Amino acid sequence: DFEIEVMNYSIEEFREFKTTDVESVLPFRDSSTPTWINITGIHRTDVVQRVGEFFGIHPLVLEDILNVHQRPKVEFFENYVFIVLKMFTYDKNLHELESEQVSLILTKNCVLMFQEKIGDVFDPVRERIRYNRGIIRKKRADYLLYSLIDALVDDYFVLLEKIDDEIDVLEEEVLERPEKETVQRTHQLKRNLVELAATIWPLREVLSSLYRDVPPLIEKETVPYFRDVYDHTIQIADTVETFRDIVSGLLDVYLSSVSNKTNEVMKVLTIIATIFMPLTFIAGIYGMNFGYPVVLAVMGVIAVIMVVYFKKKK
Template sequence: MGKMVHVGSRKVGVAPGTLIHIGKKHLTEPKITVIDYNVDNFQELVAENIEEVYPFKDSENVSWINIHGVHQVDLIEKIGIHFGIHSLVLEDIVHTDQRPKVEFFDSYIYIVLKMLQYDKDKEELIAEQVSIILGSNFVISYQEVIEDTFDPVRDRLRSSKGRIRKQGPDYLAYALLDSIVDNYFVMLEKIGENIDALDDELLDKPTPKTLEDIHHLKKELIFLRKFIWPSREVVSSLQREESFFIKESTSIFLKDVYDHIIQVMDTIESYRDILSTMLDLYLSTASNKMNEIMKVLTIIATIFIPLTFIAGIYGMNFEYMPELKWHLGYPVIWALMITVALVMLAYFRKLKWI
């Protein structure tokens, strides 16, 4: 929390629209790729400099400009100026801690979503901000890292599978949104596998590590839910708002994305209920184990109370105690204590305490 406040404080007192990158620097140098296509033609290139993408603003085809790395603010500013993107939007693009949202402008639509990846080493979810600019004949996407879930979209464009090459930029934007949302199911599947493993461990032999893993998964679900709820409003707004940039035929597909988000939300809530039940079960199991231990210790202590009393009496060694000089005194006392112990054990067993 302290680190987040420290990073955000760099913007205190700065004029609105000032571009300051806030977030981790994942790449040394930004990478710009361009895919320009229509039904019959397809062109894909890696731009060496930002000026190479300028002509695609007025291309007769649909152009997808993808920028990996948003830390180089001068590059973001140049492409923003050329494509007529508002400075406040550019500010949000380089500030990678944005909440998922959508904003409608006269010449484009600005969309922010979170793309999730799973770190196998740390066993945790990692969120990457994806900003999308939907224009009349182009889509510009901004990403923080190179690894992403857009490769299936690229493959469909290259092979001309489906309707993507026959549709406009709004359908391309839908395909990107759908890819991000579908990846949520992959993340939930991994969380579900971890929950199943924890469930087996909980029934077999739970340890303090089990409790730690349950809390870790609950935090991940809260982390995931933080991005899913506003994403629902993003897709709902795209579907509901009347915009020149989104055709009615594409709105039907956006409804499908909305339904997928609802499914993700339902799954998250189900997982949260399961983890809450598992937490209660763990605490109940730990409490039962503690009760069993306390019961055994109590029974042992109860048995030794009369034995200690007998040993205390004959340990006083008064001179005129009649049993002190009796040659059978020692074995008789032993027999008495053993008898008392056995009688108490039999009584406890009759009460089903043991």
Template sequence: MKFRTLKKRTDTYKKKLGQIPGSIIYTGKKLEQQLFIEAFDFNKEQCIVKQLSSIEEGFEFKLSNSITWLNINGLNHVDQIEKIGEHYELHPLVLEDIVNISQRPKIDDYDDYMFVVLKMLYYNDDDEMVSEQVSFILGENYVLSFQEADGDVFDEVRERIKQAKGRVRSMNADYLLYVLIDAVVDHYFVIIETLGNKIEDFETEIFSGNVDDDISKHIQDLKREILKVRRSIFPLREVINRIEKNDSALIHKKTITYYRDIYDHLIQVSENIDIYREMIWSLMDMYMTTISNKMNEVMKVLTIMASIFIPLTFIAGIYGMNFEYIPELSYRYSYFILWGVMIVLFISMLIYFKRKKWL
């Protein structure tokens, strides 16, 4: 089982072995994902929302005076990704990174656009954490977002654009990128809140003594979730920091304050993650201590039982010897006296152990 897991993890990298740099090779496993493209073209006065049947339909928005957001789901359609790259004049290495889902959160600054990669985390309907890579291309008046599959955290952003809520319809494309990244970071808070609740539930369960046999496995799964969140958040801090200090014309000064707010949120999430990591180790120590205490209780009961029966066994052993002459055996009431002595001895030892608080 361990070998199969390791093989599954390394398949992603084997797909790119020996390939020419800039080769557009999808490294994910959702090969049957259908291509889904949605377009939002808006300004203060109006908003056009379209579901596109082909990527060519979205090319007309590039020359518009409004702000355009093209959201592309389905990284397995590399031919469509190539068409986007040709139309928007994206570097081949950018296209390679878009379809390579094992990318670390990062930012690359080019002459006419900015490339940002981050990890989107959320819980699905089965209460399982989903980690999906999201890539953004920020241009002068457009934002392109690339996702591996359907399902994201941008529903509120879509409603704000449609209903003209907030500043998104009156700001530039860099603010739209901020809104999208902020939606991802806001869901980090949902993730850590859920993780915190799980840790508290485990603490309560361990302290109450009602420990499930699979709790160690659940704790290990929770530990892996925390590490996954940590790997997504810590590099993103560097990304936001670089956006703040970037002198690109794509990032306006009035928008930098908003990105600084995202950075503050990431610091807060990072601190909570570090705290939860320590709490997870404490949970394991608590669990092992609980197991040890239960074992000690069992050993104490067994030891007390052995201590009680040792003298009784000694007495029974003496009078069970096969000597021809044992004076007490000839006495008529020896059997009842022996029982009485053994009962008195048994009760006395129980009283003694009770006073010592060993029972």
């Protein structure tokens, strides 16, 4: 896929368009009114290059934009702030989660964006812009980021939800469903949970590090805003920790459950054994080729003497 979307807006108005030409966005560098140049489809490296070059982005900072397998970070430069993030997509049921990586380059009045596939969680932001809702138009571009970012971080809540409600189910399946591939299901969660954890802890650190310093900040306007996002990014990485703490000691339940049922089966076998082994032994004697109720009575009394004795076991 490949599609470039821009949303230049001022305090008063805006336009939007989805051109697939490269050059038709460059002039916006000098635009003194907040623009949002979203470059969906990063597979075309020729485009990032040209843009990179124009805006005065470093060559390595570009490369990072291209290399998806990277830990989220926040780089501070002389001209532009560069952040990378990774939003997720849990395939509910098909227990497995997938990870697109989005890169953000803030410069003057331009929030430059780089997605690798169409679709995101930024719909809410563009439209609040679209039909002027909330305080987005009123404020500058450095805010705009701290809107996109708010948007991304929000998404993780959804997942958590999904996961809580996953846990809730995959808890029940140990307690009272000792079956086969519950086990495998469990281990798919921890896996999922670890994988996640080390993408929030570093993302947490981004909004952590984006808080301490900040050059184009508009101090008491954009800052105390994203404190309330940094705050989110905490809870996220707090919650996770909770999950990875309950999930951790779950398999153990399963085992207790199972090694407890094994007790039951074993027990019945033993009890059946213990009465008809001897009773079939007596009657074995009396197939020897070398009072009929006398033997049955004694048998039938022994088969009691047992079932009694088995009231310390039941």
